[PDB]
């Protein structure tokens, strides 16, 4: 059992896992969607209620047992070991879609190495529609069918989505994006090549550069006209909207997927931690850092958005129509296009995006690798590197379908599914098992023998009452809202929302499958079957 080396490595790795590439285009826009300045109170309330306790429980479970994601159940509740396979499937889908998003970002960064950025102009071969969504103009030119030049660059030069008719017509493949994702996967494999020592040593670099970049972007966008209205609308409270349950659901889900429990990542990181390590300080510091980073990212994004909205001399909230990753690659592309320093800012921003994605990819792949390794102790001689290569190959195979010309549809599908009521359900089952079958008293005693002091009554009541109930409430709210995805001029058909449902279910189905397998593997009556299933086995 190898350790983290220096204590800073574990904290930096957890922080890098916390700072997701998704929240650098989601969090400010969705904050604007609900409340804005008044969204912070539900955000922090739901954080304290359900996100921090789940982070603490995952860190404590990972540290106490020194195991991965499939053997901690053997050490806790053997009947619920299918959570490991669910985590593996979730990590596979996440790696696929997240790495093709990385491929898009890397292609953008490569195209950003020119003195004149290619997305500023509309004279290119891929600019065939309209070019009326320009900036720094005084005339009145606006039609309902216009398209921004950056939108043309994104959807017709990098994505090349104009060559596909939707999810039913996935024709062609982008070789440039293929090479970009090949380089990205090679970097990921070389980072998780040997173990966690090199992973921490590279996280020392790829997790601190994003913070410097964010600081530079914030303090250079603050000196831009029109940012005042953007930051005001970001911090304009709307207490009337806070009455409905939708804002509460949104805040709880946002904090849950920003901290990100149930992915099997924190358990792997905490497994390499010493027994005498203090989980309380690390968990609190990481949660505070994640919240502050989200706030700073929202601040700088809204500063840029308000700057360009005042430049356009038009009303605000008419530019946030681009949701998901398109927000960055369109809005920020235009922003740095109009900025004095274009190449420098574009390269810096896309490098920061690459590092943000790199931290998450390293974290998830190392978590799944540790889960596989700990499940099979007889595979510890040389299976590390070969298993890393196999996982990278499997992720490449999964991203191959998303690598097509019209792959953006399946990317936006795998982004909105397998990241909804699937990780939430996995985390809910994890918490239920740990605090109902393993016993809250036993877990508290283990944490007391770990740190030296038992957690206060706040955790002891929250873990048992609020977090499972809040996760169940989130799942119930999400299941009652039908999904209607909408990409650029494409409405998803009925079969798309069924394929997404099947994809989301395929990961979750592992837990009931293993439940039935372990129930039927041993003969006997049902009652003592569930008796021995819950009770663990001594080493």
């Amino acid at each position, epitope marked *: 059992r190898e350790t983290w080396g220096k204590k800073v490595d574990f904290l930096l790795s957890v922080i890098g896992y916390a700072v997701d590439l998704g929240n650098v285009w989601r969090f400010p826009y969705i904050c604007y969607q609900n409340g804005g300045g008044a969204f912070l109170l539900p955000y922090t309330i739901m954080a304290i209620f359900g996100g921090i306790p789940l982070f603490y429980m995952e860190l404590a479970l990972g540290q106490y047992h020194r195991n991965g994601c499939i053997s901690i159940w053997r050490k806790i509740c053997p009947i619920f070991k299918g959570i490991g396979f669910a985590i593996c499937v979730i990590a596979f889908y996440i790696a696929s879609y997240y790495n093709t998003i990385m491929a898009w970002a890397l292609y953008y960064l490569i195209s950003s190495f020119t003195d004149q950025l290619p997305w500023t*102009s*509309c*004279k*290119n*071969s*891929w*600019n*065939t*529609g309209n*070019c009326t969504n320009y900036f720094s103009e005084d005339n009145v030119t606006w039609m309902l069918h216009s398209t921004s030049p950056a939108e043309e660059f994104y959807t*017709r*030069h990098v994505l*090349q989505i*104009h*060559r596909s008719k939707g999810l039913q017509d996935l024709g*062609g493949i982008s070789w440039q994006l293929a090479l970009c994702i090949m380089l990205i996967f090679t970097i990921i494999y070389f980072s998780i090549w040997k173990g966690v020592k090199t992973s921490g040593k590279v996280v020392w670099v790829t997790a601190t550069f994003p913070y410097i970049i964010l600081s530079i972007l914030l303090v250079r966008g603050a000196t831009l006209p029109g940012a005042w209205r953007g930051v005001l609308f970001y911090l304009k409270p709307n207490w009337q909207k806070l009455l409905e349950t939708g804002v509460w659901v949104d805040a709880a889900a946002q904090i849950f997927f920003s901290l990100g429990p149930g992915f099997g990542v924190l358990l792997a990181f905490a497994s390499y931690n010493k027994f005498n390590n203090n989980c309380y300080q690390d968990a609190l510091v990481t949660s505070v850092v994640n919240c502050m980073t989200s706030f700073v990212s929202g601040f700088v994004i809204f500063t840029v958005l308000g700057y360009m909205a005042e430049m356009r001399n038009e009303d605000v909230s008419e530019v946030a129509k681009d949701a998901g990753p398109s927000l960055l690659f369109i809005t920020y592309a235009e922003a740095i296009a109009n900025m004095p320093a274009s190449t420098f800012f574009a390269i810096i921003f896309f490098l920061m995006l690459i590092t943000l994605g790199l931290d998450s990819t390293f974290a998830g792949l190392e978590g799944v690798i540790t889960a596989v390794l700990d499940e099979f102790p007889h595979f510890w001689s040389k299976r590390r590197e070969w298993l890393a290569l196999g996982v990278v190959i499997t992720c490449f195979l999964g991203s191959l379908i998303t690598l097509t010309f019209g792959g953006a549809y399946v990317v936006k599908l795998l982004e909105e599914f397998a990241t909804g009521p699937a990780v939430l359900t996995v985390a809910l089952i994890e918490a239920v098992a740990v605090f109902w079958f393993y016993g809250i008293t036993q877990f508290c005693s283990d944490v007391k023998e770990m740190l030296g002091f038992s957690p206060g009554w706040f955790w002891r009541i929250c873990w048992v009452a609020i977090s499972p109930l809040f996760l169940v409430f989130i799942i119930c709210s999400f299941l009652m809202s039908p999904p209607q995805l909408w990409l650029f001029q494409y409405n998803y058909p009925q079969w798309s929302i069924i394929l997404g449902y099947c994809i989301g279910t395929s990961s979750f189905i592992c837990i009931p499958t293993y439940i039935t397998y372990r129930l039927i593997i041993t003969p006997g009556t049902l009652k003592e079957r569930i008796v021995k299933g819950i009770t663990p086995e001594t080493p």
Partner: antibody
Amino acid sequence: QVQLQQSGPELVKLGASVRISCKASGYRFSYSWMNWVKQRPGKGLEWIGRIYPGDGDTKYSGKFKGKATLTADKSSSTVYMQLSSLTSEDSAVYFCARSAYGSEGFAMDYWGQGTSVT
Amino acid sequence: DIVLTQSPASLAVSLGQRATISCRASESVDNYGISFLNWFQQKPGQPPKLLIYAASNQGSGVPARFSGSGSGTYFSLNIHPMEEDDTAVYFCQQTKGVSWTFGGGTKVEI
């Protein structure tokens, strides 16, 4: 209704220059390439270059880059194409056409009338 | 630079017959699913007139008899039924990255 107006016929002595205009109208002048075409008497078409009035960028085909200069005035919607050190080899008819968008293949849908430069 | 060769250099097609014009490029012209090749028509003493754009779509003032085809490296333009007013020197032009060039010119007679 897209109409392109070109300058009249001109005569240039051996060792002088010329300035050929092209007044486009009827469309978005800043959002379409302006391509000049050279045609010797009895020979085939020869591409001279292109210019984008929106950004002012200019492109060329071959050795014409060192001889032909392309300028565009947005206010007057006129495109100029200067020739330096004209000789007998350039006694041709120069056309001016506007290119289309991307998926149209930058098509030369609308042409001018050609100037018989001697 | 892409070099285009026109074959045949001169065509003699009787009235009512189908004409065939072939344009071969040095490299490929497809960039984003669109064939960056266009077909022109130049009568003597008249400016060139666009016939087919994107190698498959006809122009506004082009009759349905003119049909263009060809993707990648080989492109062909067929006129059927050919009439008398088709006695013009056809051209094929590419609109690739930097330098654009014309073909050789097919003199269709009769």
